[PDB]
Design a protein around this ligand. Structure first.
Ligand SMILES: [Zn+2]
Ligand SMILES: [Zn+2]
Length: 63
């Protein structure tokens, strides 16, 4: 089942997968995932400033 790896394999997105090309990270001092894919929020470019992940701001769109 699935495609697991060693306990020596660090991850990033809410997907729990390895390093990747295009990335942005949540701006909260309380985010417990801290990094995300562009496509895990629906981005196509890289903004700069306070940005929030989908469980942190996009959830306020009636489920
Ligand atoms: Zn991802
Ligand atoms: Zn976050």
């Amino acid at each position: 089942m699935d495609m697991p790896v060693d306990p020596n394999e660090p991850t990033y997105c809410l997907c729990h997968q390895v390093s990747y090309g295009e990335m942005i990270g949540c701006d909260n001092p309380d985010c417990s995932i801290e990094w995300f894919h562009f496509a895990c929020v629906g981005l196509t470019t890289k903004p700069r400033g306070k940005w929030f992940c989908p469980r942190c701001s996009q959830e306020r769109k009636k489920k």
